[model samples]
Target: NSPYFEKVLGSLFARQVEPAKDYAWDMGSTLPTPDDLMRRFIVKDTLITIFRRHGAVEAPTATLYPKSSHYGPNAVHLLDRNGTVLQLPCDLVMGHARSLARIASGPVPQRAYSFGNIFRDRQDGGQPDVYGEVDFDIVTTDAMDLAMKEAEVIKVLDEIIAAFPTTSSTPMCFQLGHSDLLQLIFDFCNVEHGARQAAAEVLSKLNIRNFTWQKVRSELRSPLVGISATSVDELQRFDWRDTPTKAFTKIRNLFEGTEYYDKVSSTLAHLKEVYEYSKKFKVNTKIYIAPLSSINEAFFRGGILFSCLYDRKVMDVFAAGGRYDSLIKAHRPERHAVGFSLNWEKQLAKPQGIFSAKRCDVLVASFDPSILRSSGIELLQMLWAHGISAELARDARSPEDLLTTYRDESYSWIVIIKQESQLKIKTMHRKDVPDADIQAKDLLAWLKAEI
Candidate 1:
């Protein structure tokens, strides 16, 4: 939740060129301030991975092919630079993917928790709704170990960026968690050896200000005409059958429950006062809401849709939806389905706000590719193989290009192989590193101290 989703997004939307000299915080602060809106990219690399890894991902059923593979210049909704929102069908996309994956293997796997701005086409007048929501694209695989699956997700992300070039012009970096946690618990850390970890737990309860709408519809048109009718009839038959028992028993549970009814009425009165007082802050308060009856049906396949909201300084969810499985099955038999929806306007604020932190400290800049090709390269490889990120320049470039690459890539230490075959490592920036030459096995321990 602490910008893992945003990091993945930024990696995909690597900078094509360095930004111009301008205030990063829109004149509010310095450059490189935590904008949070650093990157927005369109991804295509998952297609092949999904195809090879998951059987049901093979397409023949209804698919979400782009209406146009390439958009016309200045097209309203498909431009690259503009804050354009594309109303792609996530429901149809995920539903079929899960269905196919289940058919190909066993049950579909749970996915990593994720947050995003989901744009959807509204049923009213073809207007688009940009749902600032969360999604966990359950990777269609069978392995359930969370760490391994998370690693696999990281691998997929790495491959996705690797598909692009590695020149200084390319800025893609696979951003992943340094520590493992399924859910993010905020660490309130201080400089002097003290830290407190706190988890923000949020839940949205139903409010009766919104009336309940039950789906009694039978077909797509006339609901309440099918099995619901039968259920209602069955309910009526129960009262008829209970009459004989009641007559013989001579004792009754009803007509002695006015106390319970009175208690409910009093509680409702208190809630109405609370509702009135809360209106002073804002005419409209936000919360995660869902149609209750819609989710009860197993067939509708309804699931939760949530998101972070910044304006409210918390997460807000206006609507939750999914396939109303029972209603769909009872009404329209033999049809496959599942779905969820979130309203974007309610999520104007970003709950998972942007945070700033330093990148790597030990910059291993290799000037000679041959050294990297030989023992020197082997050492760099070994360091990285042991989880050390040693920056290497693999291609032949001018001295100026190398220097520029070093600066743009933000390399602080240069590990140059001298003409005499001796290794010279120079530290730059403000990094205070150890003097001892460490082995690959100690890289993690070393990083722990440096960080």
Candidate 2:
């Protein structure tokens, strides 16, 4: 676990510009294989890599929030076997934000990140008991750079998907909306103050791909029936599904001269500002202005709320979060926070196929135990001494048998120990490099030259 975990984690930190001054722990350049890719590996790599590139600092958040905790909605109510009172984390933003409230010497615009096991009763597809996630949040007293912050966050999100490239990507789509804008539209549609929250709860269920347009219109009126026929007609006509440029334009045009135009005018402008800034940062993913777009969290406030989905899947979000200023405002006045989280379960997708990625550089094997003890131990130490990874094969086995066994596995270098202080060296992957016999003393230099 530590091998693969610390390797990628180390490499990422080594190449990063310091957030405060700097800190680095690195693994020598070596790409991990499917064998090395643990469940925790990808979650952490994505969390650490994407955030570090943006200079996000990590906050300490392990073993749930200590002492009394009272966040609602995702209260799984789990406790340690010791019976001490602790709230298991259901998400990272709140826990991380709480950690910020009392942090010593926090940097401005606190670009903090975290990863941990989160408990939830249900998850997309089906509920797993728990899953660890990656969260990146920006909290600052200076929230005026709303557009700039939102764009940068979106860019980081794009970097995350790019981390697993090509066919492994599982193509993604982004939905961008502002809680205030959606609320304004709800009010304009005649949804009253008391029912507006309920309206949002219902609106969170809106899925453009799942239901037909008319079916969407029918579901739209379920929570608030005060909407007039004309308003409903306009809502039904909304270009609720399209690219940002066209979608934002159509919403603006569609609402022009309407009764609630005054209410939505400013909020709509704010949402557009985010979309435009997102483009400026080259966050090329299509951000649909498909109004009222949201996730299960419902923790969004009067700022940008964005969600990414599989290009083909309609039911689950790959990742989502937005400007949740209210969450931290209660704990620390005048502080605003905007953030996003990656669903590890969704992102560490099954590799449809894989290629060579050996966990070890050398496999020292022998049919002779005496020769194995004499040279095998020394070979391992020398390899380790020089920072090369090698594994010793146990028991007597024919060279062909050993080759056949590890053929489906990763073996960049295989040394067949046929006699004392003498071995045959060859690479399973490099067919052009013919096998050669050499004294054990020359092996280190020989390997060093090739490397």
Candidate 3:
């Protein structure tokens, strides 16, 4: 008996919502709210569905931050309309995780997802004053739970790549590397302990000078003692462009018999788990084991860092996030966290998919204003219930006044209310065929024929 309504619901779910919005909120006097995540019909739906697969709930969110937030260097410090100075959040990890973990209530592992405006002071040399941030974070103090959760986070990321409209032909790469591993590499190269932090960024630079080892060496000649010719050869050894297993094995051998062996083995143990987890999940896009882990804007003191890239050669990072275990522990020493955020603008630029601005399908008009004052709303509701996009004519032009104007503009089908129960349907700018009249009860059925 409800099959018809069930069919209606099915079609309803396929309907599109509004069009895309700024991935980072840019122009509002205030910041974005969770509800503002409704930028497009499918974009948020695709993301939320994946987050739920990993058991995520709404994350804690706030707009105004204390004067001194963790991302202070890049955070926006400005005066509002009221002339009061306010600091806006620039990241979700440090400021939010401390409190977010407490709500988890224990070490059993909790997941939260949130999307809101995060402002930065144009720190990257250029960017919108605001950028929207969609985040998926897992909080747990248990060490085992932490490992598995990180895997699940990666698993969820794998789903995102699957849903993405690209294939191997275009090729997307997830650059995965560990900060501790980078430190080990730096130490092996004999870089000063004080210089390790600065050298963490050297690998990222290595790619910037590709096409010649001699040219690359020229960049390294400034050699802060350890990074001289002595360390350059060692650095180039693990710069392998291989699968995870091979890179891990090769890295282990390179450190073999050295004081760094135990440390490399310990880190690779978890990396081995990450590789196996990807295998089990059938993570299609190769998660490249980057030759070296380097600096991320966010904290990566001890955990792995990942950046989503476009082509293997041209590094265009559209999405990135990583395990900020040390960053989290600094705030909530009992908690461990890992997550990533997508640059909506980058997405808007790449990938072709179902996305568009607000549009209309049917316009409900009343020849007599009195008729609409009585039965107009019900007809509109019936149209909406069936997933038919529509709008009512009350723009002070009377029925045909506004009707023909909209007819001139954008409507495909116009529903004219000449009576309380029957509707006159006319197709826009087509054959001069007479309009079809249908009982309001059969309105859904009639619309179904063409839609």
Candidate 4:
């Protein structure tokens, strides 16, 4: 369980959890520190700010599951006051895009976004994982237009990456996939249901969490599998061929010269439009139209996945969304949909310095609680009014101890309030700088300048 989960349930089920403390104790800390809270707030705020800049308004978190979308039953289910078991939700903003557009019987708004949590059951642990996501939708109808919007989405994500202190230097990249390619692959195999399931399995295993490309290759090579060579000698004879690529090449050849080849070529042509149009942004993005890289979600008509490499290993996907015209048709006819979601938690975890920064901008402590009690609230209110983030020390500690504690908690500035002593500003990391006392009237000005 995560710290957030434990905090919510631990209080109400304290008695029930007593017997499980032996195991829970080994599960690590179940409480968030001051720094954790600050980082979470910053991530949420920064992303929402980015969206708002591009014509997206804050969307309502309360969403009803649209039967038109294909969200699975594994989403969190809740029993409401009406005795109806409603799904808690696993998407920040989906299914509602077309509905919003249909309300006016015209083109949907250019942009809409939401910052919220999504719940899904983990196959590895069978526990519910609550993920923070920033979902965005752009309404466009044309296939190539939707692809250009995808490019715009990537450009916006680059802005988001730069907003974080930790990830400003981290490069953002993307891979594009077309549902038509997978559709053709299924059609070539002449197998619908079975091919769809296998395709889903391959896509699920393609994720960065535990990429099972080798297992996928092995499954295709197994004797019972009709995908490849019948014997080891047959596979070994072609030493020049990469197994997965070779299999896809064979699939490619099977449809060559047939009417179906036009489908493959047309899909490639559309991806080319996206690739060429995205070049203006100057972001490092690569187009991947691999036959094996198919989306499992049936609603995804044409889409892309944005990701980044951390420590030279593929990290979890950072954002994903795509064209879902069927979704629009499911709600009403003659509307189009295209959008993407920023995996807020995944991006938050990517930054190496996410937890390395200070929380509060300024820290306050008093030699005697009553000495500054009269003015402490005023000081806090003043700092807040000036747009400075300030916090009072939670406990009584000496000036030296307070400095040490504040430094340990990652506070950069310290202010000591006293009856007789002059108020001073102390730096945490600048050893060469001496503490400077300021006139009472100049204090706010000094903080506003320094913080």
Best by lDDT: 2
**Best TM-score among the predictions, by candidate number:** 2
Estimated TM-score for each candidate: 0.33, 0.76, 0.73, 0.74
Quote the positional error of residue 164 for candidate 3 in Å: 3.5
lDDT of 3 at 74: 72
Best-first order by TM-score: 2, 4, 3, 1
Give me the runs in candidate 1 sitting further than 4 Å from their true place.
1-323, 326-363, 367-373, 394-403, 411-414, 419-451
In angstroms, how far off is 312's CA in candidate 4?
3.8
Model 4 lDDT per residue over 1-451, tens place: 5677556654644446454554544354355665566777777777778888888876566555533335566776654433345665677545365465456756446777766777775443334666667777776645547667866776676677677765666544454556776566555554345446554445534635656455655654554343443332232222121223344455467567877987777675666666666678755533343454444446564444333333235545656666666655655645555666767755674333445455677777676777557566677788898787788775565776766665556566777776654577787635687888876567777765764
Weakest ten-residue segment in model 3 by summed lDDT: 349-358
- Cα displacement (angstroms), candidate 3, residue 208, comes to 7.4
After superposing all C-alphas onto the true structure, candidate 3 shows an RMSD in angstroms of 13.4
Better lDDT candidate (3, 4): 3
Q: Give a tens-digit lDDT track for model 1, residues 278-382.
A: 233222322211111122122222221222122122222233333222333333212222222333223222321111222443454445666555756655766
Runs of candidate 3 with Cα error greater than 4 angstroms are: 1-41, 64-73, 78-86, 100-109, 122-128, 166-169, 202-233, 295-298, 348-353, 356-361, 366-375, 381-389, 394-413, 419-422, 426-435, 448-451
lDDT of 3: 0.66
Pairs with steric clashes in candidate 2: none
Q: Model 3: per-residue lDDT, tens digit, 1-451? A: 2677566666766777433333333333564443233344457777788788777887657777444544446777765443445777776565665564445664433788887787768643344477667777876765775556666677776677776554334577777777778878878887667545445544555453253456555555555423567777777776755677778877877898999899888888877777777778777767778757564623767887776666556456656777887775555536677887776534732332434323577778876777776678888887787787888876344545665565434566777787648888887635575689888888877767765
Q: Model 2 over residues 333-450: C-alpha lDDT tens digits?
A: 3567788887664456333222234567798888888878877888888789888889888765787787777765667788888755678887765778888999887888888788
**Whole-model lDDT, model 1:** 0.32
